[PDB]
């Protein structure tokens, strides 16, 4: 009885002089907590959400229920000398949990309710599902009463046999009317759940559906990489940061975006390692280095000059580093000689010598067109071994040893021909820093700057002579860099306002000119006392303006300048989105089913929605405006689609839809026309008889029809144009503010029809797959409860740590939610039988655009040819786009999808220009997933649950099975001519299982999948591997290209890199003041760099995150701007311009600096949203006030490192350069019916 | 002399990225309720800034901790037995729920149950959590002034500006910011256990954790002014206070805090402090309150000392504790490096969760600067945190211990860089500030490398001394309801038994 | 109305003071976390400073009147502080806290019942036990008129004589009523009441009075257990 225990016996011994008494009194209520903290089991998982943390987490049962979640700690242990990973982890990863039962999960499959009154009407009267949607779907007025009820409540809850019918019959109905490339498919990194967008993807390809692409389209490919080392994108993990010695954060926010890597950092700086921050505002990452520079955002790129600047003059010419020397010369491009054209009184820089163009052609038979000159130390020309000719067509000399590419000897190649010259000729280069808008310092001195460079005239095979001079002479005098031939636009010093010095970058960027100059010093000083460990951190902060290759390749000359790329602990490191899929060939033929067919849909989605979403009918950038001033102008007339539409007719980029004719047809034609479908096809494109869907996207039969949304969150997230998009691919109310090209009277495009009134409301069908009701979903006719990341399994890897691990159900899904693996599957199932009689075994003829890292990527070696202009002929593959035939089982749909395909045994498997024999694994995995015991795919290995699936990534991939691995070097080793096995035959054994993954993460072995290696004793390390394996980096030359020489980068100015202003969007002085509302309006630079309180849209309706946020959609502002404004904090505010309009709360802050304001990204727009005093809509979002608008150098194909690869290259959505106005509210109405709106005063 | 342990904490502020991770995992664990959803025992807090609640380091205020009386005894600044016992009907000092923010959630069933034919596309607007009304606007949270989220003029007015010209601090060139995660201190001379009416309030004697008996709390919640760091909430609903418990379910067992294990920074340590019980009120009491925090490390004991060692072992330390506690982080970086400073010591009670002051870049000069003593890197006389800023937070308004921590973590750097980039021996920052070579590389470990099993060095408390775990491993959890457990009386009204224990005595002796 | 009369004054009393009893020991064995003042206070700061300290100044000045008043015998010190010169007292001193007390309860139903924050997250018992016992003021000092009209104390003699009838545990209690005036009667019902509902409402915050605080010692430990 606690009463009786109130009846002196228990005080025990007082304390610090009566200050204190010991109790000896009862503590069984302390159980109390004890109890709370007891669960039923911890489940290993991690996030399938784009944030490149890929961290493991225990997941927490009790009650038979998701608790909470902590940090894993078991990764296995870095080196002695490094720091470990655990625990990772951040904030939002910490409160997903909330997610599983909140108010807002999504538990049945629902659809809009016009939609369901007419299906089930609709049945009622064809007993055939086809046949029920055509009914609705051909009827003008059922087709817009569902169309324009998006987005506007009217969900009902239905079910998946219902829901599954009505994907199904409409997706057949669209593929056998329209085409199958008229279905699509966005579903974005697949690196965080591998099977999970595996899933759409491969039921997607099986019909002959789009896949569309998300690392260009979100602007995390940083176009400058392929231009330069022919990758997409490979860097050092974060461990690696703790090798180096010297860091310098370039417009990456690490403690906020790299969350669960900054320790690295933090802890690298007790090694004596120097950080040096550099971002305009006063970001967290300042508070953790030595030193904060603040330049004017977007002019970044001429302070990366101005340090190269003095890097060149002080570490290469003045007192040459013989550490920097050897590099550049054994790993750029920079020995290579380049011809030179004639001007009016000048040269300009043409393309590179080939030595195709030399008599003899320097011994080279094979792609002589397609191997790079230089000149060794001994005056002799030759053409050295890595240039990409000696790729394809021959084998053993695609390395980087310095020898001669004819008699294979040992050759030096010379740098400058300044000692040795013929001549001094004066050439023209470029300048930018002159143009720009009010809002960016600028500097007067001349559109074209010219500079002496030492020349030497050669005989040319063709009779002809020509001046040629060397990408290193050519890159120091477009540095300004005085070399002794008194040129009056080189520096005299630092303090001359000249071509790239210290004092001219002071002026544009407003960094102090001294500060510039100390740390161009100590970075440099750095990399030559430790042979390259001087790294640089860059992230969107650069990355997200339109002139992003420019930022980039001005950080990524410093550090090839100062020898660090290739060298652990220096380097360029990348960090945007998670795209690092480790074990990629094992995944590739299961998202793409290519273990099946071959090839599948790929689409470059900016191009994709700047057409679709007819965001090119407001387009108010030129490419005239871009244009290089020494370029024939008149060769690039057009809308910049144009270049689009030309790019996709000469097999650069992909199309979709692809023709105007279904694809289905076309081989019936073929047959009746007395010839096969590809020669068919071709007269046919000759001819003009079948087009190019691009040439009329509005006709009516060349927009998508069907679209899956899934791992995404489209429109309210990575929709750049997102008026556009409800507008014409929803038909939903808009809040557009300005006119079109026709409303204004502009020129149209001269590759693309135009029509005054454009086609809206395009997309027929919308499913959208998720665990929250999200805004897409919102907007959506078809909404499909997914499982959440503690609910299902599937792998995650990322490019910061090297270790393999899994996401795995802690619980069966709840209420009637689904895998994205199991919902595919089941809609792969009712399809199969839906189509029966609508589609059988049917011939697809298929466009696939020249790939990079394929034997066809060298097209066009000395120019463009535009065959439809009869500048050549038409050949697919090397003109054109490559015309394949692709037979289509639809109605065993269901079975492929569910076994592992013919092809890997019959063809084999492989990626990145290799490919090897993978029998082997399919023996193991036949034992592992069992097999079919019947049907079509008998005796194929299974792929029923997501665990089968894994296993087959894990099996396939060289990454993660040592024996794969082996093949895998072997491969390449032929093309190089030097062993590559060493690098895992000690791994040989390895195989990592999904079981064994869920028990202890396991780091994956060195593949030629990248250049990095993972190993016991070196961290990773981009280009490691062709640093020193000698494996050449799949460029033109074979080595680091400093100098583009394709046709187009150099009349678009961009042969050598340039300082670029940031563009004039014009979206603003066309609205501002059209619609008053009595507060002062003013315009402010719109940036957007990824919030605190959430991954990309991911956790911004999550309770826990809103609550340590600001509770909801807001915007930062000067204090200066916001006082400016009268708008104090958290008021609401508007923000608009020509694209749309959002609405917000004002966070006033002293660390943002005038003239810039931020709304972290993605905060969407199903959370605290009033209505806009613009649109008269409810608010809009971050994107409102975004548009597409493509840069033509990013369409370039058919070029060596410049050719297509899903994902490679292609149009980015960039979206830093963008304006906006503010103003402060007037009236907050809630657009709700409950009366409860509120008035800003003044 | 009575040797007691604890398991103190020392956060390295320099290490922390401020991401509130250490927030959301011990919310998500132990305050989601209804009642303490507004609560946050581990909350991060932006300097400058005011805090959560607003303005808590304002005593005069909020009249928390001590306060020394000119005869020099310790009073609570709340008031004697009888001033506080006087203010129980309404305790004119209680911060109010708006001093925190209002507890919000959003409709997002409104986005799922939207009718048809919506004239507005639907959103989901915000919901008191208090009242269950709609709220016009959200006005306030527990983060809001998070990455200076606010006019500097009101930013400024954080306590720890006082005897600072600030001015120059609103100057863009001159911004900073750092981080402050904190929890409950679970001192040694606590405020809140001396204000606390019916004695609800106790430190646990093996392991210095301080919680608020649920059973026995009345609700008079005199104890939440007592609190100078406000960290004990008041739980709206069931009329009852809670606080960080230091998590001892766990510490039991030899685990790290659910905030120490979750730090993304590894910036948190855990480590076995000896302290000498009988030095408490001696050392709250000292006359200068610049001294007690060298007072409060004269109070801690000397782990490897065999004269500590023996009477630990005669005061009942178990041999595991002892041990912990001769490896333990925490006493290195408090008593040997002298790295971490106790948070506003002035308050008087000891507090046992300590601070690595954080570094922060150069300060804006006229031109590029020149290498002083420690070359590329920073001296401690170009850090733009004003020192005097980080002594007011720290140690009283003494810069000394302040700038003597940041001098030897980058005296540290100094000599690393010289090791790992030149490849030399260089000593001269070490001297300079007083380091050794050996010291230097064992801070090195702790503070770079920072292995887990180096970060978190927790002993059991044992919970099978004085006490009987076999009936307890076999019966406990078995939550039926025997109305037995609690007290000490076997006697109750209901005739039932414990479950967990054995009734039926042995005859056999 | 002799029955109503009995049941009432004889055998109520023991009924709401064996619940009294029994139920705040049962509730206390059982129901240790539930056993809280339960303050509102931090929800709304408003008012409550004033508005409790009246009615818990007045309210104490009450029960000091009331207990020395009808538990202390009348042999005891009958000379220095005969019956009359007690109802002097409490008419007065009783009267002015009665008066304090009305006032802060009725300023605290107020905000119980109109502050937003304070009536969501009520209970019902606690609008209930303030209800009555502002009632039960109300009436308290309606009687002083009545008291009035017998300065002789020949009416606070009635009263006391039942309720130490009752305390004693002396048969017939309800006799040493016969004539009160009707007032009387419904404050003592109203009164006993309060006592029945005590141990099912907030009020056993009353048996938690912290006298023990003045003379403990501040620090506390407790040793393992
Ligand atoms: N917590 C969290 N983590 C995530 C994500 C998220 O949504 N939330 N998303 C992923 C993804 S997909 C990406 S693409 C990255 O996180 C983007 O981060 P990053 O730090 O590079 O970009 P950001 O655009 O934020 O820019 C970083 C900072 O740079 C500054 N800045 C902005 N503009 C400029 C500029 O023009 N020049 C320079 N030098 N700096 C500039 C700014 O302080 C910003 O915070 C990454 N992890
Ligand atoms: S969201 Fe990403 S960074 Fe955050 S804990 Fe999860 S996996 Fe890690
Ligand atoms: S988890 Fe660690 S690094 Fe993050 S805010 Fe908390 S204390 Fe700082
Ligand atoms: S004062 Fe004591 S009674 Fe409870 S509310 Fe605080 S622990
Ligand atoms: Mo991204």
């Known amino acids: 009885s606690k009463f009786l225990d109130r009846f002196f016996k228990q005080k025990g011994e007082t304390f610090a002089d009566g200050h204190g008494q010991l109790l000896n009194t009862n503590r069984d209520w302390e159980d109390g907590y004890r109890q709370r903290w007891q669960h039923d089991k911890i489940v290993r998982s991690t996030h399938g959400v784009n944030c490149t943390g890929s961290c493991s987490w225990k997941i927490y049962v009790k009650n038979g229920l998701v608790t909470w979640e902590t940090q894993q700690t078991d990764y296995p242990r870095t080196r002695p000398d490094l720091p470990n990973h655990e625990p990772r982890g951040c904030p939002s990863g910490a409160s997903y949990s909330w997610y599983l039962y909140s108010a807002n999960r999504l538990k049945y499959p629902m659809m809009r ?8 009407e609709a049945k009622a009267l064809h007993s055939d599902p086809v046949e029920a949607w055509a009914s609705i779907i051909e009827d003008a007025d059922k087709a817009k009463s569902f169309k324009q009820a998006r987005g506007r409540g009217g969900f009902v809850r239905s079910s998946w046999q219902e829901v599954n019918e009505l994907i199904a019959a409409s997706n057949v109905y669209t593929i056998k009317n329209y085409g199958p490339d008229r279905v699509a498919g966005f579903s974005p990194i697949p690196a965080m759940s591998m099977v999970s967008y595996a899933s759409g993807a491969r039921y997607l390809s ?22 330069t080392w022919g990758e997409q994108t490979d860097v050092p993990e974060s461990a690696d940061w703790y090798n180096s010695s010297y860091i310098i954060a370039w417009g990456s926010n690490v403690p906020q975006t790299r969350t669960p890597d900054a320790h690295f950092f933090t802890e690298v700086r007790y090694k004596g390692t120097k950080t040096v921050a550099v971002t305009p505002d006063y970001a967290e990452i300042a508070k953790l280095c030595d030193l904060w520079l603040a330049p004017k955002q977007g002019t970044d790129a001429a302070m990366a000059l101005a340090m190269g600047h003095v890097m060149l003059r002080e570490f290469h010419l003045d007192n040459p580093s013989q550490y920097f020397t050897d590099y550049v010369r054994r790993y750029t491009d920079m020995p290579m000689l380049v011809m030179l054209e004639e001007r009016d009184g000048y040269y300009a ?8 163009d030399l008599v003899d052609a320097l011994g080279q038979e094979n792609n002589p067109e397609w191997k790079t000159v230089a000149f060794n130390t001994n005056g002799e020309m030759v053409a050295p071994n890595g240039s990409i000719g000696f790729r394809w067509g021959e084998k053993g000399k695609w390395n980087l040893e310095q020898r001669d590419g004819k008699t294979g000897e040992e050759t030096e190649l010379q740098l400058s021909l300044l000692g040795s010259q013929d001549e001094i000729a004066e050439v023209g280069f470029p300048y ?7 809002h960016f310092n600028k500097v007067e001195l001349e559109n074209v700057l010219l500079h002496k460079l030492p020349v030497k005239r050669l005989q040319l095979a063709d009779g002809s002579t020509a001046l040629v001079t060397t990408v290193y002479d050519l890159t120091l005098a477009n540095y300004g860099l005085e070399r002794g031939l008194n040129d009056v636009n080189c520096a005299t010093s630092y303090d001359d306002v000249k071509a790239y010095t210290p004092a001219w970058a002071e002026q544009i960027t407003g960094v102090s000119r001294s500060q510039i100059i100390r740390i161009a010093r100590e970075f440099a000083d750095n990399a030559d006392k430790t042979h390259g460990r001087s790294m640089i951190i860059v992230g969107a902060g650069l990355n997200h303006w339109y002139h992003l290759d420019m930022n980039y390749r001005g950080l990524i000359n410093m550090l090839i300048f100062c020898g660090c790329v290739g060298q652990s602990g220096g380097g360029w490191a990348h960090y945007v989105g998670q795209e690092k899929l480790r074990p990629q060939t094992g995944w590739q033929p299961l998202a793409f089913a290519l273990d099946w067919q071959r090839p599948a849909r790929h689409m470059n989605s900016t191009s994709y929605f700047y057409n679709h979403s007819s965001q090119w009918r407001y387009e108010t950038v030129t490419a005239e405006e871009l244009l290089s001033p020494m370029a024939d102008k008149s060769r690039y007339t057009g809308h910049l689609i144009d270049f689009n539409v030309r790019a996709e007719r000469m097999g650069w980029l992909p199309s979709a839809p692809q023709l105007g004719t279904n694809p289905l047809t076309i081989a019936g034609e073929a047959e009746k026309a007395g010839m096969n479908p590809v020669d068919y096809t071709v ?5 003009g008889s079948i087009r190019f869907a691009a040439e009329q996207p509005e006709n009516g039969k060349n927009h998508p029809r069907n679209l899956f949304i899934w791992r995404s969150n489209l429109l309210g997230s990575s929709g750049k144009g997102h008026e556009f998009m409800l507008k014409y691919l929803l038909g939903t109310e808009h809040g557009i503010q300005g006119k079109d090209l026709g409303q204004q009277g502009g020129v149209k495009p001269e590759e693309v029809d135009w029509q005054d009134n454009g086609l809206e409301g395009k997309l027929d069908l919308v499913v959208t797959l998720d665990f929250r009701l999200s805004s897409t979903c919102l907007y959506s006719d078809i909404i499909l409860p997914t499982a959440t990341w503690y609910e299902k399994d599937d792998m995650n890897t990322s490019d910061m740590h090297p270790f393999i691990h899994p996401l795995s159900a802690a619980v069966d899904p709840a209420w009637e939610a689904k895998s994205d693996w199991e919902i595919y599957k089941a809609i792969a199932k009712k399809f199969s039988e839906v189509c029966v009689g609508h589609l059988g075994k049917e011939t697809d003829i298929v466009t696939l655009p020249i790939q990079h890292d394929s034997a066809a990527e060298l097209a066009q070696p000395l120019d463009v040819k535009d065959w439809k202009k009869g500048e050549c002929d038409l050949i697919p593959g090397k003109t054109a786009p490559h015309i394949m035939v692709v037979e289509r089982d639809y109605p065993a749909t269901y079975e492929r999808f569910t076994s592992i395909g013919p092809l890997m045994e019959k063809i084999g498997n492989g990626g990145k220009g290799i490919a090897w024999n993978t029998q082997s694994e399919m023996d193991l995995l036949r034992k592992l997933n069992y097999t079919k015991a019947e049907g079509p795919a008998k005796g194929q290995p299974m792929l029923n649950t997501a665990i089968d699936a894994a296993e087959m990534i894990l099996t396939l991939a060289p990454e993660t099975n040592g024996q794969v691995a082996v093949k895998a070097w072997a491969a390449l080793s032929e093309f190089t001519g030097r062993d590559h096995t060493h690098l895992a035959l000690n791994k040989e054994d390895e195989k990592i299982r999904f079981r064994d993954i869920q028990a202890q993460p396991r780091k994956i072995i060195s593949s030629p999948t990248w250049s990095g290696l993972e190993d016991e004793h070196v961290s990773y390390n981009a280009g490691y591997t062709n640093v020193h394996e000698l494996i050449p980096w799949r460029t033109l030359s074979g080595r680091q290209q400093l100098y583009q020489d394709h046709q187009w980068m150099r009349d678009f100015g961009e042969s050598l890199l340039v300082y670029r202003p940031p563009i004039d969007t014009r979206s603003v002085k066309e609205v501002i003041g059209q619609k008053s509302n009595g507060n002062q309006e003013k315009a402010l630079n719109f940036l957007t760099p990824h919030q605190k309180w959430g991954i990309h849209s991911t956790y911004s309706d999550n309770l826990l995150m809103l609550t340590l946020g600001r509770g909801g959609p807001v915007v930062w502002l000067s204090e200066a701007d916001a006082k400016d404004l009268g708008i104090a904090d958290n008021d609401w505010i508007e923000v608009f311009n020509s694209n749309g309009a959002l609405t917000a709360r004002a966070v006033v802050s002293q660390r943002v600096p005038a003239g810039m304001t931020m709304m972290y990204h993605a905060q969407e727009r199903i959370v605290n949203l009033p209505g806009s005093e613009i649109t008269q809509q409810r608010g809009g979002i971050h994107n409102s006030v975004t548009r597409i608008t493509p840069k033509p150098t990013h369409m370039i194909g058919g070029y060596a490192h410049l050719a297509y690869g899903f994902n490679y290259y292609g149009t980015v959505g960039s979206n830093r350069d963008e304006f906006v106005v503010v103003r402060k509210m007037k009236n907050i109405d809630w657009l709700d019916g409950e009366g409860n709106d509120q008035v800003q005063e003044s | 002399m009575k040797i007691r342990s604890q398991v103190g904490m020392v956060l390295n502020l320099d290490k922390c990225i401020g991401c509130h991770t250490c927030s959301v995992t011990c919310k998500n664990v132990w305050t989601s309720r209804e009642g303490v959803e507004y609560a946050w025992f581990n909350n991060v807090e932006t300097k400058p800034g005011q805090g959560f609640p607003t303005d808590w380091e304002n005593q005069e205020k909020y009249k928390g901790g001590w306060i020394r009386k000119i005869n020099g005894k310790l009073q609570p600044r709340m008031g004697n037995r009888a001033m506080l016992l006087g203010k129980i009907f309404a305790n004119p000092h209680l911060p109010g729920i708006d001093d925190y923010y209002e507890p919000f959630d959003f409709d997002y069933q409104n986005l799922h149950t939207a009718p048809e034919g919506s004239k507005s596309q639907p959103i989901a607007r915000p919901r008191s959590l208090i009242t269950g009304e709609r709220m016009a606007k959200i006005e306030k949270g527990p983060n809001w002034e998070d990455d200076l989220g606010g006019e500097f003029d009101k930013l400024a007015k954080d306590k720890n500006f006082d005897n600072i010209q600030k001015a120059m601090y609103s100057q863009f060139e001159n911004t900073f910011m750092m981080y402050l995660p904190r929890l409950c201190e679970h001192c040694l001379n606590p405020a809140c256990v001396a204000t606390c009416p019916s004695g609800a309030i106790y430190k646990r004697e093996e392991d210095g954790i301080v919680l608020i008996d649920q059973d026995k709390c009345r609700g008079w919640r005199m104890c939440i002014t007592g609190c100078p760091y406000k960290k004990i909430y ?12 230091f998590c001892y379910p766990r510490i039991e067992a030899g685990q790290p805090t659910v905030c120490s294990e979750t730090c993304v920074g590894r910036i948190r340590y855990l480590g076995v402090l000896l302290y000498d019980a009988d030095a408490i009120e001696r050392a709250a009491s000292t006359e200068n309150e610049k001294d007690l925090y060298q007072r409060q490390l004269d109070v801690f004991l000397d782990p490897n000392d065999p004269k500590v060692i023996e009477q630990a072992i005669k005061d009942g330390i178990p041999l595991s504790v002892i041990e912990a506690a001769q490896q333990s982080p925490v006493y290195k970086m408090a008593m040997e490096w002298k790295l971490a400073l106790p948070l506003h010591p002035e308050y008087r009670t000891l507090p046992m969760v ?36 980080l002594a007011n937070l720290l140690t009283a308004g003494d810069t000394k211990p302040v700038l003597r921590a940041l001098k030897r973590m980058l005296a540290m750097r100094h000599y690393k860089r010289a090791e790992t980039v030149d490849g030399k021996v260089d000593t001269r920052a070490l001297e300079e500030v007083g380091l050794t070579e050996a010291q230097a590389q064992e801070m090195y470990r702790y503070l770079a490398i920072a292995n887990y099993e180096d970060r978190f060095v927790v002993p059991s408390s044992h919970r099978e001394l004085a006490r009987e775990a076999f009936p307890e491993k076999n019966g406990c959890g078995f939550t039926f309801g025997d109305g037995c457990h609690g007290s000490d009386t076997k006697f109750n009204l209901f005739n039932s038994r414990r479950i967990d224990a054995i009734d039926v005595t042995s005859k056999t002796e | 109305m002799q029955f109503l009369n009995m049941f009432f004054f004889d055998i109520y009393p023991y009924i709401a003071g064996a619940v009294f009893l029994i139920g705040s020991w049962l509730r206390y064995d059982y129901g240790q976390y539930t056993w809280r003042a339960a303050s509102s206070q931090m929800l709304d700061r408003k008012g409550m400073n004033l508005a409790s300290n009246l009615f818990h100044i007045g309210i104490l000045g009450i029960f000091v009147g009331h207990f020395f008043g009808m538990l202390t015998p009348h042999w005891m010190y009958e000379a220095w502080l005969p019956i009359e010169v007690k109802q002097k007292m409490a008419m007065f001193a009783g009267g002015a806290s009665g008066v304090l007390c009305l006032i802060g309860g009725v300023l605290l139903l107020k905000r119980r ?52 009838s009752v305390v004693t545990f002396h048969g017939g209690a309800s006799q040493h009523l016969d004539g009160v005036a009707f007032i009387f009667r419904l404050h003592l019902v109203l009164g006993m009441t309060l006592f029945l509902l005590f141990p099912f409402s907030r009020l056993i915050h009353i048996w938690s009075v912290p006298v023990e605080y003045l003379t403990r010692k501040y620090q506390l430990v407790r040793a393992r257990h």
């Open chain 2, 234 to 245: 008041f739980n709206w609903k069931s009329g009852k206070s809670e606080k960080c418990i």
């Open chain 1, 206 to 227: 099986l019909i002959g559906g789009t896949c569309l692409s998300f690392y260009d389209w979100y602007c995390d490919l940083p176009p400058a990489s392929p231009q």
């Open chain 2, 354 to 389: 300590w601070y690595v002051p954080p570094l922060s870049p150069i300060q804006s000069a006229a031109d590029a600067g020149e290498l002083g003593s420690n070359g590329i890197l920073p001296d401690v006389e170009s850090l733009r945190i004003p020192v005097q800023y």
């Open chain 1, 432 to 438: 930018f820093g002159g143009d720009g808008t009010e």
């Open chain 3, 113 to 164: 019942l109109f502050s937003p924050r304070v009536r969501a997250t009520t209970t019902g018992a606690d609008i209930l036990i303030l209800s009555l016992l502002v009632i039960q003021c109300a009436l308290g000092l309606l009687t002083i008129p009545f008291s009035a009209q017998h300065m002789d104390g020949s009416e606070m003699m009635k009263l006391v004589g039942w309720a130490q």
């Open chain 1, 683 to 687: 007269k046919s494109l000759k001819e």
């Open chain 1, 349 to 356: 820089a043409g393309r590179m010598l080939r030595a195709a």
């Open chain 1, 113 to 120: 309710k016009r939609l369901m009154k007419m299906w089930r």
